[PDB]
Design a protein around this ligand. Structure first.
Ligand SMILES: *CCC(=O)NCc1nn(C)c2ccccc12
Length: 321
């Protein structure tokens, strides 16, 4: 059953012709009501995406559902048609330095807006960056997004985490809940590295292997950076490891633009406090062809299951005839 009224003709995803605006669209079927976690993430995404309005963030064009809570078993979310995503594109296409630069610009431009709303995406990765045939880029999937909460970021060593392993910042495995903006910049750095070589930079195979990969390239954290980790189990883990030297970025990425590698270095900084912020990244020389802060807008203001289905029903009311 993929039931999108008569408006759209010709969980599960599908393209479809929109008969009111005469353009094809994307439509995603969400059958979330059988699982609490599906419900929370569905509501969080809808609320965020309906509030956001930005060229580099996917919009919601329409939501299709039954006219009553009792009859509502699925929700269909209608979005702008985007041919592909950066995951699919990297599996077959070499990117020119110009394409890398432009994609990175648009990721950071979109992220500036998200962070300006005090929201963290928390699962940036190539498959969450949609592209069209003219290489317009739009960030999607806000199912794991949270309002930033730096005063409650601390946690113990080896705390389980939900977001995609290969794009997790080192501190997630050590002492962080992923409640600060620096979590997203690490993921962007991973994406930049992946654009440079078409391969994930830190493809860990399980939770602690991810930190092994990171330390294998950045090398051992400095004394200063360790002194910032008060958590004893995390600190002592790091002190137990043999000394590892930094792998120079220009050896890992011999064809890369030197300015790209300087910015990469700043996004993939071990210590999240020293990590570059989104606005500094936009102002970096690598992006000087595009940087224009007047044209990098910010958000106008900061942003059980039975009540969750009611909340989703209420949140989707404005699209009803
Ligand atoms: C954020 C991940 C996601 O929703 N991917 C599914 C998807 N694939 N295309 C080509 C899309 C276009 C518009 C919206 C969602 C799309």
């Amino acid at each position: 059953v993929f039931d999108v009224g008569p408006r759209y003709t010709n969980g599960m995803v599908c393209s479809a012709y929109d008969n009111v605006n005469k353009v094809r669209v994307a439509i995603k079927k969400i059958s979330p009501f059988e699982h609490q976690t599906y419900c929370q993430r569905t509501l969080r995404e809808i609320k965020i995406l309906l509030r956001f309005r930005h060229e580099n963030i996917i919009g919601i064009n329409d939501i299709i559902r039954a006219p009553t809570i009792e009859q509502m078993k699925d929700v269909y979310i209608v979005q702008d048609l985007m041919e592909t995503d950066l995951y699919k594109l990297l599996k077959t296409q070499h990117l020119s330095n110009d394409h890398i630069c432009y994609f990175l610009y648009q990721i950071l431009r979109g992220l500036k807006y998200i962070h300006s709303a005090n929201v963290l995406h928390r699962d940036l990765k190539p498959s969450n960056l949609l592209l069209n045939t003219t290489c317009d880029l739009k960030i999607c999937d806000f199912g794991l997004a949270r309002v930033a909460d730096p005063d409650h970021d601390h946690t113990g060593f080896l705390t389980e985490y939900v977001a995609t392993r290969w794009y997790r910042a080192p501190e997630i495995m050590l002492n962080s809940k992923g409640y600060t903006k620096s979590i997203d910049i690490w993921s962007v750095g991973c994406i930049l590295a992946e654009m440079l070589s078409n391969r994930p930079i830190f493809p860990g195979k399980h939770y602690l292997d991810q930190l092994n990969h990171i330390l294998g390239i950045l090398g051992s954290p400095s004394q200063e950076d360790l002194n910032c980790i008060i958590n004893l189990k995390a600190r002592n883990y790091l002190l137990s490891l043999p000394h590892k030297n930094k792998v120079p970025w220009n050896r890992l990425f011999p064809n890369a633009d030197s300015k790209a590698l300087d910015l990469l270095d700043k996004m993939l900084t071990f210590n999240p406090h020293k990590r570059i912020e989104v606005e500094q990244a936009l102002a970096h020389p690598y992006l000087e062809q595009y940087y224009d802060p007047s044209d990098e807008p910010i958000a106008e203001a900061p942003f059980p299951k039975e009540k969750l289905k009611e909340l989703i029903f209420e949140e989707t009311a404005r699209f009803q005839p």
